[PDB]
Each structure stands twice: as structure tokens, then as C-alpha cells.
């Protein structure tokens, strides 16, 4: 991987592995989500981040994902090379946005795109705080000044409000627990695990007959290493749509909400 000529974005090629593909011999949405995370970390590394700034480490501040939105047109096949370009942009004091474009390395065609909203939080108290001016300037030199959006469309699906699923859910997968492979280097549950847990309540018949086109996920609260999760799905719709909810198995405390859009094979 390498920063582009202008130094304002990062590109990386990946060869799709055998264990990274599903029944269609193409990469799963969790494999894609892992590759976006990987290219995102390599971009921060390439511009001097061990992605916390000098001031953030001092104040015990971290960047946390609030929303993730992925749209896939063609999932890469096992053995294919996928090129991913990523960049960040500040969206005022609300936080930052990280965008990705996935391309077929051979043809150059856009096979997918993604966007994410990040907010500043104290690692210890978990309290959100707006981006201070001194923090903002530290990372403005690594972002393009003019707007550059993976989702520029007038009324695009990446900014739609997500409602709360009402009980009874149509489908459910109960008692989901993270294992050590689900934890990152800081022993927190990886953001990608929640995508897999959302998809666990989709019936196998939808998975076998449809392709996942769009997934939007809101992150409300993190699942601890010793927490148990319940995954809920209700159909909201030639295309299938679902409303999703992740909540703590005990008191029913919300951890995530989302929607998926599937198209017939």
C-alpha cells in the first residue's frame, strides 16, 4: 500500500484468500469490512499515527465509529485482486468521516464503496466530546480541503435515519458471545464482529438466494468481552429489506441498529 501522489489518500491491493470467501466463492461482507479496516490503519500509519494525535493521547481521547455504510456491486472472487482507496475528511465539531472506493484491480471498475462516521470519546469515562480546534488542525493537513464523498447523491442511503425494531422480531439469533478471535489488539470487540452478529438473524434461505447489496449499521454501545448478545431481524419489504437490532441478552440494552438490502441472484 501507498499514499497517492497528492498524499491526501491511500491505496492498497489485496488478494482474496480461500478462508475469506463464502458459498458463492466470493469474499464475504465481513472480509470486505476487515480489508477496509486494514487499509484505514495502514493510511494512519503512513502519515505518522502509531489514529490518535499528540493532544489526544495526552487527554486520553480516542476515535470511535458511530455509523458504517457499505454498498457492494460485485464481491471479488477467491484469488482476485481488489484495490481499495481510502481518505478522511473533517465534518466540523461533530467528528470525522472516512470513505472508501473498492475497485477491480484488473478492469478498474468500481465494485463497491463505503463511508463511516467517527466521533471523539474519552477512553476512560466514555463521554463524547466535540473536536477541539487544536485537535482539528493536527489532522486537517492529511485531509483534502474540497469535499470528496464516496456517496455524493442527493438522497443517498448512507444518511437515512434508522428506526428501532419493535418486538416481536420476525427472526432472531440468541446467546451470541465473542471469542478471543473477535477481540482487537486492545481487547475490545472488533467493529466487524457486530456486522456478522447482525447477519446471523437473516434466514439461510435469503443468504442462499440473494446477494447483500447495502448494509448500514449504527454503533450505540460496545459489547464487553463477557457480554451476551441477541440479534433481531424483521423484513420491511424483487429486492429484500430488513430492519436489524443488536441488544444485550439480559436487560435488552441496545448496542446496534441497522438495515440491509438484498437482491435476487
Ligand X SMILES: CC(C)CNC(=O)c1nccn1C
Catalytic residue (choose from 24, 122, 143, 188): 188
185 SS3 class: coil
CB of 136 to ligand X, least distance (A): 19
Residue 100, C-alpha cell as written in the block: 472508501
Residue 97, C-alpha cell as written in the block: 468521516
Q: How far apart are CA 117 and CA 69, in angstroms?
A: 9
Q: How far apart are CA 261 and CA 212, in angstroms?
A: 6
Question: Is 238 labeled as catalytic in the residue annotation?
Answer: no
Catalytic residue (choose from 223, 238, 244, 256): 223
What character string, x for contact with ligand X (CB under 6 A) and - otherwise, covers 86-105?
Answer: ------------x-------
Beta strands in the chain (DSSP E): 2-3, 10-15, 61-72, 81-90, 96-104, 110-122, 171-176, 210-219, 229-235, 239-248, 254-264
Q: How far apart are CA 229 and CA 194, in angstroms?
A: 10
Q: How far apart are CA 70 and CA 29, in angstroms?
A: 9
Question: Is 69 labeled as catalytic in the residue annotation?
Answer: no
Report what 17 binds from ligand X, its own copies, none; CB cut-off 5-8 Å by kind.
Answer: its own copies
| Residue 37 engages its own copies in binding (rule: CB under 8 A) | yes
Q: How far apart are CA 8 and CA 27, in angstroms?
A: 28
| Residue 116 engages ligand X in binding (rule: CB under 6 A) | yes
Report what 36 binds from ligand X, its own copies, none; CB cut-off 5-8 Å by kind.
Answer: ligand X
Question: Is 223 labeled as catalytic in the residue annotation?
Answer: yes
Residue placing its CB nearer to its own copies in the complex, 177 or 263: 177
| Residue 178 engages ligand X in binding (rule: CB under 6 A) | no
Q: How far apart are CA 83 and CA 36, in angstroms?
A: 11
User: Which of the stretches 34-42, 134-142, 144-152, 165-173 binds ligand X when contact is defined by CB under 6 A?
Assistant: 34-42
- Nearest 5°: the CA angle 151, 157, 162 is 135
109 SS3 class: coil
Neighbouring CB atoms inside 10 A of 126's CB total 11
Looking only at residues 170 through 189 of this chain, which bind its own copies when binding is defined by CB under 8 A?
175-177, 179-181, 183-187
Looking only at residues 91 through 150 of this chain, which bind its own copies when binding is defined by CB under 8 A?
none
Q: How far apart are CA 200 and CA 191, in angstroms?
A: 15
CB of 213 to its own copies, least distance (A): 17
| Residue 191 engages ligand X in binding (rule: CB under 6 A) | yes
In the chain, the N- to C-terminal Cα span, in Å, equals 33
User: Which of the stretches 126-134, 141-149, 190-198, 244-252 binds its own copies when contact is defined by CB under 8 A?
Assistant: 190-198
Residues of the shown chain interacting with ligand X in the complex, contacts defined by CB under 6 A = 33, 36-37, 40-41, 65, 68, 98, 116, 191-192
Residues forming the active site: 186, 188, 223
Residues of the shown chain interacting with its own copies in the complex, contacts defined by CB under 8 A = 17-19, 21-23, 25, 28, 30, 34, 37-38, 41-42, 45, 78-79, 175-177, 179-181, 183-187, 190, 192, 196-197, 199-200, 207
Amino acid at each position: 500500500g501507498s499514499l497517492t501522489e497528492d498524499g491526501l489518500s491511500y491505496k492498497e491491493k489485496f488478494v482474496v484468500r480461500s478462508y475469506e470467501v463464502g458459498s458463492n466463492k466470493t469474499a464475504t461482507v465481513e472480509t470486505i469490512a476487515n480489508l477496509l479496516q486494514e487499509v484505514g490503519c495502514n493510511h494512519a500509519q503512513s502519515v505518522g499515527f502509531s489514529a490518535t494525535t499528540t493532544t489526544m493521547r495526552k487527554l486520553h481521547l480516542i476515535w470511535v465509529t458511530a455509523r458504517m455504510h457499505i454498498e457492494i456491486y460485485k464481491y471479488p472472487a477467491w484469488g482476485d485482486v481488489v484495490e481499495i482507496e481510502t481518505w478522511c475528511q473533517s465534518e466540523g465539531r461533530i467528528g470525522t468521516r472516512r470513505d472508501w472506493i473498492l475497485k477491480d484491480s484488473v478492469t478498474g471498475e468500481v465494485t463497491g464503496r463505503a463511508t463511516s462516521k467517527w466521533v471523539m470519546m474519552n477512553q476512560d469515562t466514555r463521554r463524547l466530546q466535540k473536536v477541539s480546534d487544536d485537535v482539528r488542525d493536527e489532522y486537517l493537513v492529511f485531509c483534502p480541503q474540497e469535499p470528496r464523498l464516496a456517496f455524493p447523491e442527493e438522497n443517498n442511503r448512507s444518511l437515512k435515519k434508522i428506526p428501532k425494531l419493535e418486538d416481536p422480531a420476525q427472526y432472531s439469533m440468541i446467546g451470541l458471545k465473542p471469542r478471543r478471535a473477535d477481540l482487537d489488539m486492545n481487547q475490545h470487540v472488533n467493529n466487524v464482529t457486530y456486522i456478522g452478529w447482525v447477519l446471523e438473524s437473516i434466514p439461510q434461505e435469503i443468504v442462499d438466494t440473494h446477494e447483500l447489496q447495502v448494509i448500514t449499521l449504527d454503533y450505540r454501545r460496545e459489547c464487553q468481552q463477557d457480554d451476551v448478545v441477541d440479534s433481531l431481524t424483521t423484513t420491511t419489504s424483487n429486492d429484500s429489506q430488513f430492519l436489524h437490532l443488536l441488544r444485550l441478552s439480559g436487560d435488552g440494552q441496545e448496542i446496534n441498529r441497522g438495515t440491509t438490502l438484498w437482491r435476487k441472484k
